[PDB]
Paper text:
In Vaccinia virus (VACV), copies of the double-jelly-roll protein D13 bind to the viral membrane via interaction with its partner protein A17 and assemble into a scaffold surrounding the viral membrane. This process leads to the formation of a spherical immature virion (IV). The 62-kDa D13 protein exists as trimers both in vivo and in vitro, and structures of the recombinantly expressed D13 trimer have been determined by X-ray crystallography. D13 adopts a double-jelly-roll structure composed of 8 antiparallel β-strands.
Under the same conditions, the D13 protein with an N-terminal His6-tag and an extended linker (28 amino acid residues) assembled into spherical particles with an average diameter of approximately 340 nm, revealing a distinctive honeycomb-shaped pattern. These particles clearly resemble the size and shape of the authentic VACV IV scaffold described by deep-etch electron microscopy. To investigate whether the N-terminal tail α-helix is indeed responsible for this observation, we determined the structure of the His6-tagged D13 protein at 2.6 Å resolution by cryo-EM. As expected, the N-terminal tail helix feature was absent in the reconstructed map. 130,384, 173,354 and 156,813 particle images were used to reconstruct the maps shown in a, b, and c, respectively. Their structures reveal that the wild-type trimer has an intact N-terminal tail helix (colored purple), whereas the corresponding density is missing in His6-tagged protein and in the truncation mutant. Reduction of salt concentration to 150 mM leads to aggregation in case of wtD13, to spherical assemblies for His6-tagged D13, or to a mixture of tubular and spherical assemblies for D1318-548. The spherical particles in b were sometimes imaged as concentric shells containing several layers, or incompletely closed structures.
Author numbering:
A (entry chain B), B (entry chain A), C (entry chain C): 16 to 45, 49 to 547
Write the structure that this text describes.
């Protein structure tokens, strides 16, 4: 019995090298999209990987409510490209980069995720500081990071250029109307610095490698189809939907800030609704539109709103004041005398205590049925032409606290991507059906295999180890016409009298193509056919 | 100096294959245990792994309090078996499957763990919907998943059958007496679908492999011994205890629902006790049994309960009402005039405010010594024959809110498996002592080595990589009689006047046997001797 | 096309061995530092790894406030050494051991991290039990654990000695002045037990290996320099700063106990300040020093404190009482009529309700600007000679609740190591500059590469797999004088009128040297040159 020794190893002497952390400042150029270019030319840098982008956010002064989106560093990136003299080596969109890093909690934390950055801070005077200057770090994960020095990008005596395109500053900022965003936008400038790990290698022996480069296709607005052409060697395919808020002003009622659970979203929304829902006043409350229906709460504390009973009990109400309930705070309906969507009927029990000192109701326990979709409705959709009612019956004070939100990486139709609006998915390679499903079993598989919490519907064709094998791909057959991937979905049917029915959707299809990387005459890549 | 190249690899071309996600519907057969069978016969399916079971839970309508246990998908599974024409290939119990997946947070989340499923929802009218229809996904982790395609189950032109046995629906449901469980049970049916990843391989070269199959032995009620016979090649051995609630009605006072921390359990329990503990009333409170001792709280706010001082201060008590304290809410004792277990004496400070509108006391800060064992006591044990007192002096209203809980995967004597009731463990291989310990150092080691939070006392005999080596086992010596593993424990001594002393216990011993998998004449396994 | 089989393996038969868990009691010897020695001499133990130290903490009785620091098991360890007959094989400081385990959440949990151990418990009578006896487990991670049996420490027929030096018990205890620490210290004794996994190997074939041993250098108080000499083969270098609280009594105002988030620290601090900040009294509040400035809150609820407006609104104040605000609770300043640091001016809105029953103010919402540095100020620094004011104007009651905290593993100048006090870092190998940076990009890299949340500024020179290659090092050139590593930093500039400016700092430099491990004539190590 010849036995393999599992208590000792014969240590290999590795290639002689020395690593170094290297920072570079960029050249910035500019609706004038901001672009940073970083030039890497150094004869003693043989390979590199682990790119990190530094961004200095400035001091924010003035009046209004201002905050940064979570993961602001990732969300300010529109596009990243690595090139040489022979053309582009590897590139990615900001959405797909953020997708690839969504499971790296450390990287997400470094890119800007804290109370200081992401709470909605309030400025009271034109000289009040709303945010202090800060620095975020964006880990640009590339295929050259999977196996450390084995997968690194070798600079075969070539000059490597890294180009970063930035999103407009309105994408990364949550603000109210009181904040002077025009001035802020005129003054804001991205200040980037690029870091990487370089390797000074002694007598490097270079071999050709393989690289996967994502390619992204967005369908037209509300179409259930998208197609990616010229597919010859794909390792994976993923499909998801994005909301198109272009038909709105991008104003929402609430945003939970640094708290990012579904419960947190719902709590912020309910908190914003309670100030206009239950009113303690001397006589009929004033300052609400004519369409508002404010009723007094009887001695039994129960108000009926057409099949719905709301239980209101407030402590310490003065003897000259009564408790009032808003029975149609937000209303939606497409036909005049049919079903109505009423945000007031989603409450069952409201208790609290009136404060004589601050003249407010401090709410204690609330029983309600608000979900994430309601927190995700845009304010424009409550008052669209299709609504036969006056949708928004809130006070002017609460109307003034709505927030502009322009986050570019939102999936689905809600902030959490919690509702699945795809009820059937079909993929075709050429004309034949490659995959079909009704439930999200492919998303279950993507999450199980990548150990992620925010998976998408994904067909993965590669199950081999990463760089020590050539990746397994679905291969084209141009003779039989199998050279394109077509995706058709069936959207989940929503009620025509729910405002979320009118959020516009786009289908996104991402394809990972296989490329050969060769190192004769500098660095170059060729698409595998 | 010959140096190993650590900056380049020679990529191997792997076996030509194509993966595919495959779903199957089953054949259901039926105290009529429900059994689902899934048949896999497909000539182009060469291998498979990554089994996922889909379960559609129906709409739940009616009155009462209803909820699902956490991880309902895992808890509805009694047994899973994979077979071919030559017999069983691999099988497992539901408890051990859940044990093997306890460290996979993604899988646990997919099997049904959310507020919507696990809050105890309340139905008010016979047409109220308590739960909406939902789908859960149970990842059935098999030994064929450890190394992706290397460890996959090859179908040597054989038909593979997957059989799932389900637990009764009462195991996965938390309910009160007001819910119509008889009708619910008559109507509930499991609707399962089986998914796996199949591989269509071109010219597969098959080699024999090794597989570990768990074998489970449960000792008799309250015996400190269990033995597993016919042990010839075990890779690991684990020991834990389970509570036997068969001598009870399985009713408990509280359950925290979706919150699953120890603090959450304790908070739910204290919340259920406070409504009968402190009473604001006009005169001596009514509606309590004769054995209740309700005393008025003096001006200093301190009530003495035999060496115990409770500090009660309630704000806003009306002038016609007084504050009362329940001094023997739950009581236990075995001898008439000796030590008594009194749930009231476990409180030291109770403060709150009376609400005139809702006629309740809203409690603020509470100081207490309630632990997890108290939340884990069954209501039947408070009123057993051995209790010389009337144990339960609660109001009928609170008595009506007790929950039936029949969770099948509970370990220890509390819901969290927090108390260790094993004070000494001894394992014998044959007649010789193989292992001995007093503290839980083997559980510490199991958690450290498996990177788990819910480890058990485990002897692992294998420290070699998984599939690239033959596993290391403890080998039998039938000549010397070393062919069985005997386990004897010494239980921690509990006080005879604590009700948890009378919870019945079973010892569970799990043994992982090594099997050879061969592929001539289809798939077959043979026990290593 | 020769294809590598990725669906089958040729299983290797490994070395024949049998593992066993082994516990040992020690020999304890003793300002009399406690030292435990464990002797391992057993002919059938061929290798070992995975050391775990058991510690029994006793019952704590008496009066006062008492608690254990988080991770008490790690914090009681001063030094660990593994030796043979040829000298020390491997050793480490307690700080660096805890650093190496900071990312192992399971190990941190096992070493003592729970509400029961880490809440500040209160003893009321001299016989009250503050803490029950408990056992913690400290995983002593060694280089012999990285690759299981491949990296294990082989005992070439040698006797191995493990020696543990313990910190004084005052390092692991958080206490007030009311606790009798002199008696506690006279009675406390460490009771340790050592566990490891031993391997009984049949015909072991031993080969020489490599090991990295940390070496630690602490700079002098407040010097921005430190140097590690005799550096010939280092795999990594890390730099951080520690606070020196020797010029204080180590008393702080608050400690959050088991809650260990920055928000938790701030909340505990604000809670301790509110009792003296806002006072509901009949007339000017009494019991405060003469330097206190207590003003009555006007009808509009706004008090001005030199450019700062505090909004105070308390409900249910009796008609004979008024609301008062402490305008200089904690004050600091170095010049008589210049800038002042006033803890009262860091509040903007204070609301709450007075309780007539308990005669206290129960605070509801608070708006403030307290940060982690304020919670990290020592009480001695408020009343130093450099303060031209009476710094601490709190009541005697709150002064009596300050806690002694002597935690030995604190980094930076705050409890969370959140503020970076290093604005520039330079490393020199010999006289040449090896590395330079202004921001913490090296800490970003350390966290990204080690997947940690508490990284330090680190230069790592090794990117090769751990034990199957010889590690890559930065190599000395004694001819050119490159045989020492010098570190110089520039500290962040703090305001001279902030008390945190006067916390003393030490620079810590840790170097990982490469050693050869050989097994002829027992175990021995030699420093690589």
């Amino acid at each position: 019995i010849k036995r393999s020794n599992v208590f000792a190893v014969d240590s290999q002497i590795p290639t002689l090298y020395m690593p170094q952390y290297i920072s570079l400042s960029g050249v910035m150029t500019n609706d004038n999209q901001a672009i940073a270019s970083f030039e890497i030319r150094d004869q003693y840098i043989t390979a590199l990987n682990h790119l990190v982008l530094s961004l200095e956010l400035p001091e924010v002064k003035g009046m209004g409510r201002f905050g940064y989106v979570p993961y602001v560093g990732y969300k300010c990136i529109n596009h990243v490209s690595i090139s040489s003299c022979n053309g582009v080596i590897w590139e990615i969109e900001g959405e797909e980069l953020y997708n690839n890093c969504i499971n790296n909690t450390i990287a997400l934390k470094h890119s800007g995720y804290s109370s200081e950055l992401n709470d909605i801070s309030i400025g009271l005077t034109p000289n009040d500081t709303i945010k202090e200057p800060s620095t975020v770090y964006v880990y640009i994960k590339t295929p050259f990071d999977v196996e450390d020095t084995f997968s690194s990008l070798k600079l075969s005596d070539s000059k490597i250029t890294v180009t970063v395109t930035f999103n407009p500053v309105s994408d990364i900022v949550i603000r109210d109307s009181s904040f002077d965003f025009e001035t802020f936008n005129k003054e804001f400038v991205y200040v980037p610095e690029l870091s990487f790990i370089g390797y000074m290698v002694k007598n490097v022996q270079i071999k050709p490698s393989f690289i996967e480069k994502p390619r992204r296709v967005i369908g037209q607005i509300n179409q259930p189809t998208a197609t990616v052409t010229e597919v010859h060697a794909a390792t994976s395919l993923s499909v998801y939907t994005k909301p198109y808020y272009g038909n709105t002003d991008n104003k929402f009622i609430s945003y939970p800030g640094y708290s990012q659970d579904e419960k947190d979203y719902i709590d912020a929304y309910v908190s914003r609704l309670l100030d206009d829902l239950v009113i303690v006043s001397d006589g009929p409350p004033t300052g609400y539109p004519e369409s508002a229906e404010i009723v007094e709460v009887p001695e039994d504390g129960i108000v009926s709103i057409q099949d719905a009973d709301v239980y209101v009990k407030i402590d310490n109400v003065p003897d000259n004041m009564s408790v009032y309930l808003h029975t149609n705070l937000l209303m939606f309906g497409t036909r005049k005398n049919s079903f109505i969507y009423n945000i007031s009927k989603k409450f069952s029990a409201i208790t609290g205590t009136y404060s004589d000192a601050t003249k407010r109701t401090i709410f204690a326990h609330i029983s309600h049925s608000i979900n994430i979709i309601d927190t995700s409705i845009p304010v424009s959709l409550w008052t669209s032409q299709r609504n036969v009612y006056n949708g928004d019956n809130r006070s002017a004070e609460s109307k003034a606290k709505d927030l502009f939100i322009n986050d570019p990486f939102i999936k689905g139709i809600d902030f959490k991507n919690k509702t699945d609006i795809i009820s059937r998915l079909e993929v075709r390679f050429g004309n034949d059906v490659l995959y079909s499903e009704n439930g999200p079993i492919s998303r279950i598989y993507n999450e199980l295999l990548t150990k992620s919490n925010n998976g998408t519907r994904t067909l993965t064709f590669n199950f081999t180890p990463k760089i020590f094998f050539r990746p397994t791909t679905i291969t084209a057959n141009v003779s039989r016409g199998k050279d394109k991937l077509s995706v058709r979905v069936v959207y989940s049917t929503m009620d025509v009298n729910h405002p979320i029915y009118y959020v516009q959707k786009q289908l996104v299809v991402v394809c990972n193509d296989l490329y050969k990387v060769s190192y004769d005459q500098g660095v170059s890549i060729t698409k595998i056919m």
